[PDB]
Ligand binder design. Sequence first.
Ligand SMILES: NC(=O)C1=CN([C@@H]2O[C@H](COP(=O)(O)OP(=O)(O)OC[C@H]3O[C@@H](n4cnc5c(N)ncnc54)[C@H](OP(=O)(O)O)[C@@H]3O)[C@@H](O)[C@H]2O)C=CC1
Ligand SMILES: NC(=O)C1=CN([C@@H]2O[C@H](COP(=O)(O)OP(=O)(O)OC[C@H]3O[C@@H](n4cnc5c(N)ncnc54)[C@H](OP(=O)(O)O)[C@@H]3O)[C@@H](O)[C@H]2O)C=CC1
Ligand SMILES: CCCC[C@@H](O)C(=O)O
Ligand SMILES: [Mg+2]
Ligand SMILES: [Mg+2]
Ligand SMILES: [Mg+2]
Ligand SMILES: [Mg+2]
Ligand SMILES: [Mg+2]
Ligand SMILES: [Mg+2]
Ligand SMILES: [Mg+2]
Lengths: 308, 308
Amino acid sequence: MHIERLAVDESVGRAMPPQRFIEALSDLGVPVEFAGEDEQFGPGDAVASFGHRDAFLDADWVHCIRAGYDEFPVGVYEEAGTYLTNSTGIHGTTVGETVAGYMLTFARRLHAYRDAQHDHAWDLPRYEEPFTLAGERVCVVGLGTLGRGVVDRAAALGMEVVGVRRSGDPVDNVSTVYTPDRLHEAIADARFVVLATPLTDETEGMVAAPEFETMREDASLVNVARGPVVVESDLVAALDSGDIAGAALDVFSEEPLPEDSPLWDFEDVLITPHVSAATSKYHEDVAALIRENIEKIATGDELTNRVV
Amino acid sequence: MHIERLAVDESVGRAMPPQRFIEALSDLGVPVEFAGEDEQFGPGDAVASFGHRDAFLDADWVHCIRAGYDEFPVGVYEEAGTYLTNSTGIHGTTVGETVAGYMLTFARRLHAYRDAQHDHAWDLPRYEEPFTLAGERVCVVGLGTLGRGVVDRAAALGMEVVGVRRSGDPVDNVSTVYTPDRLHEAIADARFVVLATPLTDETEGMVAAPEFETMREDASLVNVARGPVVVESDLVAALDSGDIAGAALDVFSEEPLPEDSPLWDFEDVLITPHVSAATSKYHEDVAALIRENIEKIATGDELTNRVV
Ligand SMILES: NC(=O)C1=CN([C@@H]2O[C@H](COP(=O)(O)OP(=O)(O)OC[C@H]3O[C@@H](n4cnc5c(N)ncnc54)[C@H](OP(=O)(O)O)[C@@H]3O)[C@@H](O)[C@H]2O)C=CC1
Ligand SMILES: NC(=O)C1=CN([C@@H]2O[C@H](COP(=O)(O)OP(=O)(O)OC[C@H]3O[C@@H](n4cnc5c(N)ncnc54)[C@H](OP(=O)(O)O)[C@@H]3O)[C@@H](O)[C@H]2O)C=CC1
Ligand SMILES: CCCC[C@@H](O)C(=O)O
Ligand SMILES: [Mg+2]
Ligand SMILES: [Mg+2]
Ligand SMILES: [Mg+2]
Ligand SMILES: [Mg+2]
Ligand SMILES: [Mg+2]
Ligand SMILES: [Mg+2]
Ligand SMILES: [Mg+2]
């Protein structure tokens, strides 16, 4: 690989202003150019993009500007001989902070107060409603960049932390790590269950009616992974039946979440519009990954975040 | 002083169910009795109360179940020989968590999402709006139990932390401690300014138009102290003018906050109903101070949290 050009697909617009991103890449040593839906690639092309296009298969290298690459046909890239990288490793602080925010919102009742603020109502909680995260248990399912960002902040707040990962191996600040076949043991005693796994064959529909049964009735689910990791209809049923207490949800089976979803109306559900990782500096964070991999290519070393 | 009785004033019901507090004081070595608003007191009586009654001055000891004793006439107690203690030392975790919650709410825009949830609207923030607390500066004004509860959590979240206290003496996790005569220096570069001082002759009206001028236009004020530490009309004016960005307010010059107050309507104000220290274990927290002081009276040692 000898890269002569970085093309920036217009789909990066879904996550950030393209112009800001192009300006963040200006002294790379190769030209950085905007590319639209209908363009052609070839030897020496690198491409930064949000979604997949078949035209990218003519390029040497595609960088997906998301951590999740579940919408990329990974097998076709391998067969085409086209390198594919992702943006894992940059979302730990933003997502960890958002999730700390969700848990504190539930513990301190901030969402109920915000509801009351609209009515100008000085509504006091029941004595038993407010609690402290200190001493409460969180189970973090997926212990990568997102999961660890959550873990570190939960641990800092004095929470008891357990979690689940594919390898079952120790993780700093996690008292007990479980393999995925022991999910029900992991979630059983947790006040919060946080989902931070990629969407894969194995994780799709992982959290469904049996898991909501196992969960504490006073527990909340947090999904910052992908919508289809949860069976959304089972989630609705569990919330209506009281199998769990509530949820903070950033990702959904259909996005935007349809207006007629029952999820919008549960008091103890927080809906956020796939923004748990949002940051005014996203363009710089992704640009740094692109720069790193340019140097890797130039010096003939293995790419950071290589999917295939 | 030899205590023969602990009277539990009915005003404790403003903070916790009195039956829960009475039962948590069962092993004091003296009887614990409820006291209505028309109750007589004499030698041997200790009282546990939320607010002041002149009737208390015939008792030997009043324990205020709040940290703030500004509604108690301290000069009137000293002259009368009646001991006064407060409940400072028990609100660090509850207030610390709530303030962390407020700051994360603003950084991650959760309040705006909650507003959109009511309308079933999938409304992304503007790109420049979401940020991370990590790397941002907070000034904590008041470095006692509440202030340290805030500091420790802000520091753990990766914030730069400075603060203000009377003595100027070092405090763990505060990088620069200022005395109150350098308030403007302390607050000028802060993204968040947090108030955690008592209401005193010195602190009343501390934060007014000139301080809102000094503060960053992108900064937010957090008030978990007492309403009159801030000049409320100057706050409204500052929020209208954009001298600051917003505020999280748990305390007000008049509580409950009047429906007609303009503070309810600012998008970037969070109103909470004097609940930043709310917890379902408050009865246990308050009882343990009372137990402590009972033992110190027996051994004839100096009381904890003695006011006069
Ligand atoms: N809401 C949002 O805006 C965002 C969502 N995401 C989503 O989060 C996902 C995770 O991203 P990131 O943390 O960067 O990814 P990482 O690759 O850093 O980590 C993935 C983690 O998931 C674990 N894992 C894999 N399969 C399973 C399983 N079956 N059960 C439990 N754990 C499993 C891995 O285990 P091991 O450690 O053993 O390998 C690893 O700990 C992305 O794929 C994306 O879908 C990402 C960014 C933002
Ligand atoms: N919203 C709520 O529900 C609650 C509100 N509060 C309020 O918080 C107040 C503080 O409580 P707590 O932290 O327990 O009290 P503490 O006595 O532990 O701490 C008070 C702090 O205020 C500092 N201070 C005093 N005067 C000034 C000033 N002029 N400028 C800067 N700092 C000053 C003191 O400085 P130094 O240490 O140097 O003397 C001390 O560090 C209470 O009096 C009460 O009004 C308390 C509990 C709950
Ligand atoms: C969109 C950029 C991050 C958000 C999510 O898409 C991801 O997988 O990273
Ligand atoms: Mg309710
Ligand atoms: Mg259940
Ligand atoms: Mg707006
Ligand atoms: Mg930051
Ligand atoms: Mg003054
Ligand atoms: Mg002044
Ligand atoms: Mg209104």
